[PDB]
Amino acid sequence: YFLWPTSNLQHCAAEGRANYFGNLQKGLLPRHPGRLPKGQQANSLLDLMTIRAFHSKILRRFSLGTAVGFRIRKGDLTDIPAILVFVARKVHKKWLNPAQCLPAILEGPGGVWCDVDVVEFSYYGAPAQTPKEQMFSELVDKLCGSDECIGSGSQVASHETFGTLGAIVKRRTGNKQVGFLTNRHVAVDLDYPNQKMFHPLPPNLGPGVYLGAVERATSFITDDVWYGIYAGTNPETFVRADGAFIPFADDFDISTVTTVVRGVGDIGDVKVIDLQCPLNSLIGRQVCKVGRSSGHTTGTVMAYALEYNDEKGICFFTDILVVGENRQTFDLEGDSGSLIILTSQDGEKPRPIGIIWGGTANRGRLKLTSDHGPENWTSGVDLGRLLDRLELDIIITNESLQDAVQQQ
Amino acid sequence: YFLWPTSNLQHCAAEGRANYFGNLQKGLLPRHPGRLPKGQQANSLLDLMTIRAFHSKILRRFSLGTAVGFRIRKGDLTDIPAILVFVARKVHKKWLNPAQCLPAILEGPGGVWCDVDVVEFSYYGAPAQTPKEQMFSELVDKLCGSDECIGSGSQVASHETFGTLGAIVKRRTGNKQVGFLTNRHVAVDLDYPNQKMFHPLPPNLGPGVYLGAVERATSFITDDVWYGIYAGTNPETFVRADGAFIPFADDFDISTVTTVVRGVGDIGDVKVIDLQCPLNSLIGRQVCKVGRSSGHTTGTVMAYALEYNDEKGICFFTDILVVGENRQTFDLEGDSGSLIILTSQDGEKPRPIGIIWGGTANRGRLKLTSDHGPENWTSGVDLGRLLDRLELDIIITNESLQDAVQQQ
Amino acid sequence: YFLWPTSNLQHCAAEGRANYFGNLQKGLLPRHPGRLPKGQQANSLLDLMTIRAFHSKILRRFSLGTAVGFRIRKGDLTDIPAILVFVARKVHKKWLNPAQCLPAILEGPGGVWCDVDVVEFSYYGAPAQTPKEQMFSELVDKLCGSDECIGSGSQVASHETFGTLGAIVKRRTGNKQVGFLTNRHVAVDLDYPNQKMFHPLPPNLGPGVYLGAVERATSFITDDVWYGIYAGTNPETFVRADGAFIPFADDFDISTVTTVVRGVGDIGDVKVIDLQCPLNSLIGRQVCKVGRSSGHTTGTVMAYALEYNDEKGICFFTDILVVGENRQTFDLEGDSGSLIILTSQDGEKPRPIGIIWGGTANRGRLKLTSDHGPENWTSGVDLGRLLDRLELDIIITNESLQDAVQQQR
Amino acid sequence: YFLWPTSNLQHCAAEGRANYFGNLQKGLLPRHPGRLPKGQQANSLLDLMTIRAFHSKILRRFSLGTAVGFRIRKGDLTDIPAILVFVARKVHKKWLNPAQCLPAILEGPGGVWCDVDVVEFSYYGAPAQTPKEQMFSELVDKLCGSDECIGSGSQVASHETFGTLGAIVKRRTGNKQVGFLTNRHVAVDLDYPNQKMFHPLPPNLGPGVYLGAVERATSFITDDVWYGIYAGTNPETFVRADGAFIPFADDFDISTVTTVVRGVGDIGDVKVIDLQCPLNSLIGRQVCKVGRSSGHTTGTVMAYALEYNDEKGICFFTDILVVGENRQTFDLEGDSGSLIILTSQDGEKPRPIGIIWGGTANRGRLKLTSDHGPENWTSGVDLGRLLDRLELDIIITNESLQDAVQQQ
Ligand SMILES: Nc1ncnc2c1ncn2[C@@H]1O[C@H](COP(=O)(O)OP(=O)(O)OP(=O)(O)O)[C@@H](O)[C@H]1O
Ligand SMILES: Nc1ncnc2c1ncn2[C@@H]1O[C@H](COP(=O)(O)OP(=O)(O)OP(=O)(O)O)[C@@H](O)[C@H]1O
Ligand SMILES: Nc1ncnc2c1ncn2[C@@H]1O[C@H](COP(=O)(O)OP(=O)(O)OP(=O)(O)O)[C@@H](O)[C@H]1O
Ligand SMILES: Nc1ncnc2c1ncn2[C@@H]1O[C@H](COP(=O)(O)OP(=O)(O)OP(=O)(O)O)[C@@H](O)[C@H]1O
Ligand SMILES: [Mg+2]
Ligand SMILES: [Mg+2]
Ligand SMILES: [Mg+2]
Ligand SMILES: [Mg+2]
Ligand SMILES: [Mg+2]
Ligand SMILES: [N+]
């Protein structure tokens, strides 16, 4: 059976959204000489997303998507909170018509103001789901079945597509069995009754071991349940929370599963993305990931809450937007599901924050410097939130690995 | 959010299937010395599937699919219970390997025997979800948006696909709302939260009106639940029962909905396919369906319980197999969701028995006559068993239609 | 281990061809521009072929190809010996510059003359390896595997190609082994070391029985060896005599082979094509063939010795040209190797004359009638000559087939 | 007028093949001493092939190809005699069921034994007729018409395909004709009655001079005739000995022919590949070639007698296997027919051992190192055995070119 709400998304959820922005458009103090009293400057992700949600009506016009974060000036990433507006071709102010040129400052409910930054930006197509790696290193070999262990970054293959093993997780409800976590597009086939996963390839392709089958997956969680707020005025707003849980099979040796992210080391617990924390603790932070296509790479969290409006009137959100450092691409086709791990803040081990999303528009390009060409951007989703909606707890040590084995 | 059996539901259901056959296996009880003790001749559908499921190993050995029905000797259909074994190309025994030659009589549990027929038979692919080929008539004209009412046969369209409305159904339990029934592949999309239906076209493709959204759908149901017995030795056995229920929108005029099959007339309640009934009460019966692609097309039921072992070790079952009578096709691409109705024979109401299926093993060909080329066949889903899973009831009179809409 | 003749064999043959055609010109004493005696009109295929070979200079210049036969006038065959000239698009005289145009009569060596008929012509692409056979009748079903026996018309398949069993034959010399004849393109693959035949499909494509492997075949024969005469001025002229002989394996049930042409009946021995015989005894004759692809069709022998000069100065000849009757096609793709058989006209048994060639770039369209579209033509290899160069003998009665098995060494 | 062996001769050869291995199986008496002795280890390439031909049943199980040579541990060639088994993907031993896993040692008849090395392998498919993506150097320009002479490496071309001249060879008997040697696919073609050669292009493609026409070619030689022993259990074994001899035209200016392999220098006579000599005489020896597409390239002989069984059932053998140096490619598409030469070790003249084979699977890919991508390999036929079967003799000095041209 499949189910969708009957009267939930009509005149119970839309009127709650129509109530949220109803008040807003009465109690407004224009205050637009361009002085902007600095005590109402955005401080966290929640402030930036609330201003964008209010002014989303004038943001959709002549723009193919928006996001929140810091303003990018001359390629470099500043530490000024701004709303990133993505345009197809960024031209000089003189060649724009007045009704197209975006403002530099936007003020929202309660005088909360922020900057507006235009960024040349484009989307990629869907991956073809059996990609080429093109990274030749001793790590990719280990990741693609040449290693004697299965861990974060190892290639996981369904009957038609393969990706990467994000993390080793265990359930919370009842039997709380132990498995691994990846995104929905790697381990789920709607037109197929079961979803058997293999390492490194399924039997019809080559040699491999049977890892198990998907027990639960999510595709679409609304914005009010994902973030907890109304991220946009569109009543059909969804957050692409693609993730699939595959518990290790009964006739499968779990002792061949390591918890160390090969190429990174021992990692810490999941770091929740708190929408009220200062933006600099997530925006601009140096992250890394270990998948198979691209081995071990490192990048930068450029923006959050990437909003895209598809052909019809449905708003789709994606949580994380990472851009690789040193002009290197952060990921490649086939790194879907990889663990997004923020580099270790001084002492404590690195903590993961997301998994690489693998949907149609999971990758793309955007130009930062005029001296170089466009650079690839990689999209991710909130790990702390996905683990909440999948009832999964991450495993971080090999000793905790043996404890859940005798816990089912 | 989607769920799957944890594993244990499979582990403690696989044994029951093996335990079912192993029991009759140990005491083989041949009871067949070459000549078959008569009377043991299969009598109904259940008898035939029990012989095929017991001999599933040796039948799928050199076969692309099997189905139960009557033997087809020299093109015409007989009244002899047989297991139709589909081969890629039927040739003379003199050029056949002694091991690849299928037998004529197969023993069964307790001595229930039957014949074995060989049919040259092939498959097609997918209808690519927007078919352009169609018939031309005033009926099809009305069904594709020219009619002044919505009913069985009108064109339903998701955001990407074309289809045909099967029947105006009302839910049994719960809200007891009234909507329509069609194929799952017509109504449901994996990578989309909403499943909106329209007539005759979506707002992005052309003009139309909003009918509603899918409230429930079924994709795969196990054989022992769908039929009532283990129909094979493969522990991964499923039935392609793809149906979707779309309740009419709250702001929709039910007055423009009719419970009459345009081109067929007034119909009765659904004829439940009884596995204990004599074979000729469904096999050989002349049926008819009205969709959009082909319109009103009369056919004849040829086989039941079409088995299909894919290249990945999974068994699939499609219930009804229809071949267009008098050297014509029974349906075209886009008729997915039409009502398979039994033609009135002595004055009773034409009772519907199935709905046109959609997918990959959908519309292939088979050779019956020598003087003609291959003839198209069509897959179908058991309407009686589909309604007993979605918990729906078909409406037959416009006066009963208003009683259902007032009980919501 | 293949071999090719030496440059001496070429220059010896080369000058030999130059000498023959040269002495024709050296005494010509060209004639008056008036009447020609009826007694000197072309009478045989050899007359038409000699006149065409003499004027090969002015014929290949503005033509796709040429052939010998009767003049097609207003879409019908006449009794006028003529040299068919094939053009891509036949237009009125007013739109051709006189150098492009063609004369009505050609006068060959020795006062022998004939007509010149212009025909609109076109070639097709390559045969489809695995073609479509949309005939759908009981004869085709039996020819493709549903028959208890195997004979002329049965589908013979290599590991990647479908074909048609031409005739049950036996070798004249050697060990007198019994086999079957077919087209070379159907049964011969050169990038592979053996040519195994199967009826109806090879193991990698479906059920079937292993008939045997190709024991010998011929691709090209020179015109002076095939026709016996010099048919063209080009010293690089060859006849596409594509045939393959496949003797049944050491352990194959020959009792399942019949020498009956299903749909035609009992046939007689091969009707040899005599180049010095009258033209009407092969040109215009009604013929038939039983081919897997198209079943049993009937046609008309429209021309003979079809010439075609490719882009590298090589001249190629195909023997028979057949067009189906009643605006119908005579063959489809996959009928390659089917036995072209003269229909009985006065009680005699139907005797074959050729096999359908079916390869590289055979088959195409032919503009006969203006109110209709272009009709399909089909090429063929002279059966009488193909057996002479393959040293084969056609078996025509199942009684001769029984004894021919015992006469093997 | 082609001719093939009478099926009487085929059955006789198959019986002798079963009698050869039937003798090796009747005696046997393995009595393996556990780890086995060290003087019973193979030394010659004749002993390596007989171990593979004996164990060809178990080797074919899950191997696309096999080849004798040295064991490649960790990415490079060791001095251990081993039979290289080729797989599609080298996965760890833990992800392989014991039926598919390969043993490390194999003992054959007489107590001889050698190792087994697994190599990741793939075939490049059929190359191009008129190939592109070739090098640019003054050496390449001379080989493609810009030089005033023609010799080894010069561009020879039929009317459809390109290639290179292997060696200036003359017939041992007959008219003692003088010509050149090249690959069979480069020169000959089925659907023509004449194979005329040109340099650098045929008249239809561009400028060039008529060199000659193919007088003889051998398509396939059986392994018992080529090697002198049965190299496989399958009764259909053939060696891809594809060579052709093209004697110069009677009018061609033979003074423009040079016996100097431009790039290598003055070469010596053919180095017959002794099968009963220690493996280090061929395996590991550095080789070189002068082409056109690729020019002067060096390489390393990696294996011998590369066995490839297709899905139809035929076994095919290729003599020489060479990969490129410095992780480069040994040749490009278009180098078919160029003479492979053993580089001088002791300052002696270079000895040609093989010629580049130009059939469908003439090139391919294989992985050696984990930190780098897969390298390209090239096929070749035994030159000494090719000249023996074609009844030809290589000319190594321009003085012998005049002594050979006068004897005609
Ligand atoms: N709708 C639009 N479409 C295209 N270009 C636009 C649009 N609105 C503004 N721009 C361009 O973008 C400029 C503002 O870009 P942005 O806000 O990113 O500037 P910045 O961060 O101060 O500097 P930098 O461009 O170096 O990052 C405008 O001056 C104009 O040239
Ligand atoms: N695996 C197979 N693949 C292909 N053909 C087969 C196979 N097994 C049997 N056959 C062929 O099919 C025949 C059986 O046909 P079938 O059981 O349908 O007979 P029928 O119904 O009496 O007659 P008909 O097929 O003429 O309607 C066998 O005699 C043989 O020629
Ligand atoms: N080189 C040429 N290319 C195209 N058309 C030509 C050429 N030479 C002649 N023709 C045309 O073909 C005509 C000759 O027709 P043809 O030889 O078929 O005679 P016919 O049999 O009496 O007539 P038809 O068959 O056309 O009724 C010329 O009158 C001229 O119009
Ligand atoms: N059928 C197979 N398919 C893929 N890999 C296999 C197969 N059988 C064995 N292997 C792999 O090959 C390994 C054996 O090593 P191999 O034969 O390559 O020797 P080696 O050259 O000394 O080793 P290395 O690969 O470290 O250089 C096994 O440990 C296993 O990982
Ligand atoms: Mg900027
Ligand atoms: Mg039958
Ligand atoms: Mg004419
Ligand atoms: Mg005409
Ligand atoms: Mg190795
Ligand atoms: N032998």
Side-chain angles (χ1 to χ4, degrees), chain A residues 1-2 4 6 10 190-194 196 214-218 220-221 236 250 310 312 314 389, chain B residues 1-2 4 7 11 159 184 190 192-194 196 198 203-204 214-218 236 250 310 312 389:
Chain A
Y1 299 159
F2 302 108
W4 293 273
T6 66
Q10 57 172 317
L190 178 63
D191 288 321
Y192 216 95
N194 53 16
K196 293 197 169 190
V214 180
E215 193 233 11
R216 51 167 67 252
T218 82
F220 296 108
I221 303 177
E236 297 186 1
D250 306 67
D310 76 325
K312 284 191 178 175
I314 296 74
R389 321 317 317 277
Chain B
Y1 299 87
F2 319 97
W4 324 86
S7 61
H11 292 355
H159 305 246
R184 177 186 66 89
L190 165 60
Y192 222 94
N194 53 271
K196 304 176 182 178
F198 305 92
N204 63 268
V214 178
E215 198 257 18
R216 52 175 52 193
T218 60
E236 294 147 307
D250 305 3
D310 65 351
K312 304 174 182 178
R389 290 294 298 181

Side-chain angles (χ1 to χ4, degrees), chain A residues 70-76 78 84 90 116-119:
Chain A
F70 285 159
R71 167 192 293 275
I72 299 180
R73 163 126 64 252
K74 299 180 181 178
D76 299 334
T78 63
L84 300 180
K90 186 176 182 180
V116 171
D117 188 65
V118 179
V119 174

Side-chain angles (χ1 to χ4, degrees), chain C residues 200 204 252 313 395:
Chain C
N204 64 276
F252 170 83
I395 303 178

Side-chain angles (χ1 to χ4, degrees), chain D residues 93 156 246 319 343 398:
Chain D
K93 198 172 184 299
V156 297
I246 300 78
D319 299 320
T343 55
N398 206 279

Side-chain angles (χ1 to χ4, degrees), chain A residues 6 8 18-20 25 30 35 62 78-79 83 121 128 140 152 188 202 244 254-255 291 293 312 316 347 402 404:
Chain A
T6 66
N8 206 338
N19 293 333
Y20 184 94
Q25 297 177 338
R35 303 227 173 257
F62 306 139
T78 63
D79 60 329
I83 296 182
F121 182 93
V140 184
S152 185
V188 179
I254 308 179
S255 60
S293 301
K312 284 191 178 175
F316 293 90
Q402 300 293 316

Side-chain angles (χ1 to χ4, degrees), chain C residues 71-76 84 90 116-119 367-368:
Chain C
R71 166 190 292 276
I72 308 176
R73 178 166 293 169
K74 304 170 65 176
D76 293 321
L84 303 189
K90 181 180 180 182
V116 178
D117 181 66
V118 179
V119 183
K367 196 60 180 296
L368 296 176

Side-chain angles (χ1 to χ4, degrees), chain D residues 171-354:
Chain D
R171 281 184 54 187
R172 308 174 178 177
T173 49
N175 308 126
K176 302 275 188 174
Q177 297 93 337
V178 178
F180 59 91
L181 180 65
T182 187
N183 181 264
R184 180 183 64 84
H185 300 79
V186 172
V188 305
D189 167 56
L190 155 74
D191 294 313
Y192 225 63
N194 54 258
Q195 282 67 29
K196 292 177 292 187
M197 295 300 85
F198 302 89
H199 171 63
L201 303 155
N204 48 275
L205 300 178
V209 63
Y210 174 84
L211 304 182
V214 185
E215 177 184 349
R216 49 181 56 176
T218 66
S219 57
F220 293 102
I221 298 183
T222 60
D223 56 352
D224 48 318
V225 176
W226 188 255
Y227 301 108
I229 35 64
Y230 292 103
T233 59
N234 175 257
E236 303 165 322
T237 305
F238 302 97
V239 179
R240 288 169 171 172
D242 292 317
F245 168 77
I246 300 78
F248 292 108
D250 303 3
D251 63 353
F252 179 81
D253 182 9
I254 310 177
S255 62
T256 61
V257 180
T258 307
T259 63
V260 180
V261 184
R262 295 155 292 183
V264 179
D266 300 328
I267 68 175
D269 209 328
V270 176
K271 183 63 195 65
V272 57
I273 296 181
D274 190 4
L275 302 183
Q276 53 193 80
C277 69
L279 299 161
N280 64 333
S281 60
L282 178 89
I283 292 71
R285 285 291 307 272
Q286 190 190 38
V287 286
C288 64
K289 185 181 66 62
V290 180
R292 57 152 299 258
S293 305
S294 191
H296 184 347
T297 62
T298 148
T300 301
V301 180
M302 301 295 295
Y304 188 89
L306 154 67
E307 186 191 41
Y308 165 72
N309 283 266
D310 55 61
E311 303 299 313
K312 296 179 176 56
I314 305 295
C315 179
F316 288 93
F317 267 98
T318 309
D319 299 320
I320 304 179
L321 173 62
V322 177
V323 304
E325 39 69 33
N326 295 261
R327 283 180 287 99
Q328 312 295 348
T329 182
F330 187 58
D331 73 327
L332 297 179
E333 302 186 20
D335 291 314
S336 296
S338 30
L339 265 189
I340 302 180
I341 310 176
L342 286 177
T343 55
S344 177
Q345 293 178 318
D346 321 326
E348 72 286 338
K349 311 185 65 59
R351 302 177 181 178
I353 59 180

Side-chain angles (χ1 to χ4, degrees), chain C residues 2 4 7 184 192 217 250 310, chain D residues 2 7 191-192 215 217 310:
Chain C
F2 312 98
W4 286 268
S7 179
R184 182 193 64 77
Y192 222 82
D250 303 63
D310 68 352
Chain D
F2 306 112
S7 62
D191 294 313
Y192 225 63
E215 177 184 349
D310 55 61

